[PDB]
């Protein structure tokens, strides 16, 4: 049935970038969108937009890389080095504000969902609230 849609997205994304695709559809959900917004803003993706395919709502995700590279193996560095689900249907994961993780001494993000909406970790910390720890990303 597809059991964790948000896992899915992270994975679709993880997969498309390692073969350096320009873009990936992922079937669209409001929540998925909210996570994408962060990705976009935090400068991990170029951007994203709604689209249809076979006339059902998707989300094209435009991915983003580094420059062509030095010697044998000219593959660009990845912008999204690591994108990992934390909370999962098997095991939900929640943090109080005092215990939100700091991803790769701040060079990374942790999307995290609160009752004040979906936020990066600094975002959440600032508005002094915690919630479901969605994924890390660096």
């Amino acid at each position: 049935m597809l059991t964790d849609p948000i896992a899915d997205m992270l994975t679709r994304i993880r997969n498309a970038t390692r073969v350096y695709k320009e873009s990936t559809d992922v079937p669209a959900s409001r929540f998925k969108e909210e996570i994408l917004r962060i990705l976009a803003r935090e400068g991990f993706i170029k951007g994203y937009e709604r689209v249809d395919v076979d006339g059902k709502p998707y989300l094209r995700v435009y991915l983003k890389y580094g420059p062509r590279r030095q010697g044998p193996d000219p593959r660009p560095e990845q912008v999204i080095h690591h994108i990992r689900r934390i909370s999962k249907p098997g095991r939900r994961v929640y943090v109080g504000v005092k215990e939100i993780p700091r991803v790769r001494r701040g060079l990374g993000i942790a999307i995290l969902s609160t009752s004040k909406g979906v936020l990066t970790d600094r975002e959440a910390r600032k508005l002094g609230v915690g919630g479901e720890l969605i994924c890390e990303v660096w």
Partner: protein, 234 residues
Amino acid sequence: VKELLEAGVHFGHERKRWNPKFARYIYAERNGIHIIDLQKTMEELERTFRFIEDLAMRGGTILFVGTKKQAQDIVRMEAERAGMPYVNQRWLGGMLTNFKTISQRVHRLEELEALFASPEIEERPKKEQVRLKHELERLQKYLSGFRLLKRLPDAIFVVDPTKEAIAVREARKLFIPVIALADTDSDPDLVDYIIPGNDDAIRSIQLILSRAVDLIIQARGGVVEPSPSYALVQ
């Protein structure tokens, strides 16, 4: 003179032996074949020649490789027709990468230059006139274009990179820019300035590889003719 000169007899080549990385540079599967989007050929030419130019007029040495069957000769033309080095018969394990050692073959080839014209003009234990004048035989055959080249080139120019891979590998290992004419055979990703062309038709190799040599001499002034090359072209 470019543009429709390319469509002349030189656009698309191979079919269903492709590399799908090359899918960007393709126009269609018209009549079973891959015919190769030329607008993008031209596109890549400007950027590529632009590199040649700058490299050339900055006084650089390009290294030309085409050990291929019917590119063989139209190389050592345009290569010599521009005083640039060439590899013609066979690429050797580590010309670039094992450069120092492979050089002592050239170091020692012209030892035998200077034993032809020599005090041993007709002398030395007579069965050593094959033993040594057949050493110079092989030395001759291979290091004829390689002999000029006395430091690594600032580039290499390649006719079929999937054919010539053992070179290209050495290049990229050594950060040496890879210039090449490549068709649907090949893996763009490791060709630094690509001439999306036709590795094969002798005309195609000619049109392209000569113009590039025009640009080279022409970026030191003194352009010449329609090139001492039309082989037995047929």
